């Protein structure tokens with residue numbers, strides 16, 4: 300019969316696929332832990348094997364009727380195996396795309412910028428630039444790191460990324476999607492299950508609908524933060540303008556988390572940022588992941604495996620190897636679970652341990668499922684599980700209990716405004732960032748944004764949707780999207796939007812099962828086996844049930860709903876509306892840090908623009924050797940042109956960028972050399 304054959308086919312495929320998957324997984328591990336030419340080669344071979352095997356089983360599965368399946372377990376598996384991806388591309392195309400992927404990945408993880416005053420002092424993104432963007436209060440140095448990274452590293456990514464889009468769109472349009480974007484939204488698709496179906500376009504709509512309901516609380520968080528940042532960087536921020544992109548606590552403003560030291564509502568209270576308490580005790584990466592383990596075990600979940608501790612890399616290896624430091628949770632297969640994290644002793648590395656270990660715990664739970672279904676019910680479910688736990692672990696109640704807040708820490712209504720504020724800087728601050736990033740990639744893949752307008756459109760969407768403005772104008776030799784890990788390392792990003800809605804929904808139903816009474820934000824599901832079982836019973840399903848039904852069985856809703864996330868932040872919202880009565884709320888897209896020094900302008904090609912920039916640079920060189928008696932090697936690069944028969948420009952001193960030249964000064968220089976034409 301058909302079923303009995305297919306049953307044995309999928310049974311054989313699943314076990315054969317596990318062992319080939321373990322092989323490329325493990326080769327990807329060694330590459331990521333030990334970036335090396337050899338390991339790139341062992342990776343590429345192991346992957347080539349995996350891909351060729353899938354192409355074989357893909358065609359060999361296209362035989363078994365795509366329809367006529369008795370056990371729906373034995374149907375969706377087939378449906379995936381019949382989609383012969385990658386192989387749609389020629390062997391020349393496919394090897395090129397894998398080369399582009401390894402090149403982007405390698406550039407991003409090895410990219411370095413150097414101090415202009417000391418060329419032998421160079422800085423990786425992790426930890427050097429990251430540490431500057433987390434901690435420096437210097438506007439200029441934060442500018443240097445932000446622009447260096449996008450001009451030394453992002454520019455290397457621009458041409459590769461253009462090819463990446465061409466190749467990925469071809470593999471997708473041949474796998475029968477509208478483009479790579481649509482291929483990605485396919486992670487959320489449910490078909491053939493009435494009352495639980497979900498279409499790829501539904502994802503766009505639900506995301507845009509919910510994002511409307513989140514704007515007000517974002518706008519007020521944006522207004523409060525702007526005001527505080529006007530205090531921390533006096534005279535640099537317009538009270539109706541967008542926030543400068545280098546002033547947000549990390550390289551991109553993905554999270555506004557590190558702005559807590561500048562935005563804390565009630566600085567006199569005991570610190571709810573427990574970084575210092577970890578440093579003052581003997582907290583290392585071992586202690587951190589041991590504490591995260593305690594939490595999942597108190598909830599009823601298993602400990603980590605022996606292999607996990609044996610094979611993870613929870614610290615920076617050193618100068619003995621180059622490793623992708625991005626926290627990542629790996630399910631290599633065959634009971635092999637491990638985490639890659641260059642863990643530091645901050646509260647942020649501490650909540651991230653819980654998040655990454657959440658991935659592991661989900662991976663563990665659905666190990667007992669067929670290989671083809673060993674996945675999240677969708678990608679947001681997977682990202683939400685670590686965050687559920689992170690919500691409980693960040694509560695001052697929980698922190699007090701693991702000795703990081705004094706035993707005398709008094710919960711009052713000012714500490715909760717502090718806690719809710721910090722939470723908002725992470726959770727709410729990231730939602731516009733995330734939506735706008737993915738909205739951009741979705742549009743690039745659909746073809747709605749031409750290549751000559753990628754950066755133009757990118758910084759228009761930053762200003763408009765995010766309330767963030769670039770501090771330096773960027774032309775189409777940049778690829779600012781790709782300077783973030785997820786974009787240069789080819790990962791979807793809506794998982795971070797959808798996990799944020801999911802996580803409060805799940806937190807709501809878990810706090811009820813944990814016999815919580817009171818507001819959601821005071822809830823810590825620690826020690827609740829009833830909470831753990833409710834969650835586990837869903838985790839152990841993998842992707843065997845559609846996610847709409849998996850959501851229903853845990854929280855009683857078929858779809859994502861933003862009501863729980865807003866209830867969580869209701870106290871803080873009220874307080875923010877009060878704190879902002881004398882602030883502007885919203886932003887104008889027109890102000891930019893550099894427009895108050897710019898100058899407008901009267902067959903024209905880029906080479907004309909090159910002679911122009913070179914002339915202005917030359918003019919400047921004279922005007923400082925003449926009207927000032929100095930020699931300054933102004934380059935064409937130091938002439939920054941924006942808003943391009945018309946354009947606006949300003950001049951910066953070479954090796955400083957922040958050092959804009961007074962608009963009145965450049966004018967005299969232009970006049971002084973106006974004779975030469």
Ligand SMILES: CC(C)C[C@H](N[C@@H](Cc1cncn1Cc1cc(F)cc(Cl)c1)C(=O)O)C(=O)O
Nearest residue numbers: 624625626627628647648650651654655682790
């Ligand atoms: C393969 C990917 C999809 C993995 C992806 N990694 C997380 C990492 C993380 C978790 N909590 C916060 N972060 C951000 C962060 C970045 C960083 F460099 C250092 C630190 Cl301490 C934190 C993510 O990017 O969100 C995931 O697990 O989703």
Ligand SMILES: *[C@@H]1O[C@H](CO)[C@@H](O)[C@H](O)[C@H]1NC(C)=O
Nearest residue numbers: 333334335336337338619620
């Ligand atoms: C890193 O990779 C190189 C090349 O494969 C290898 O010789 C070296 O021993 C590796 N180092 C570690 C620590 O694995």
Ligand SMILES: *[C@@H]1O[C@H](CO)[C@@H](O)[C@H](O)[C@H]1NC(C)=O
Nearest residue numbers: 564565711712713714716874
């Ligand atoms: C906290 O409580 C006091 C009175 O106990 C009140 O005046 C204040 O508005 C409350 N909220 C704060 C301080 O955010």
Ligand SMILES: *[C@@H]1O[C@H](CO)[C@@H](O)[C@H](O)[C@H]1NC(C)=O
Nearest residue numbers: 416439954955956957958959
């Ligand atoms: C760059 O310009 C700023 C302008 O405020 C100045 O304060 C800073 O010292 C300069 N940095 C240099 C020249 O390295």
Ligand SMILES: [Cl-]
Nearest residue numbers: 422423426427
């Ligand atoms: Cl470094």
Ligand code: NA
Nearest residue numbers: 544545546547
């Ligand atoms: Na920033």
Ligand SMILES: [Zn+2]
Nearest residue numbers: 654681682685
């Ligand atoms: Zn994650």
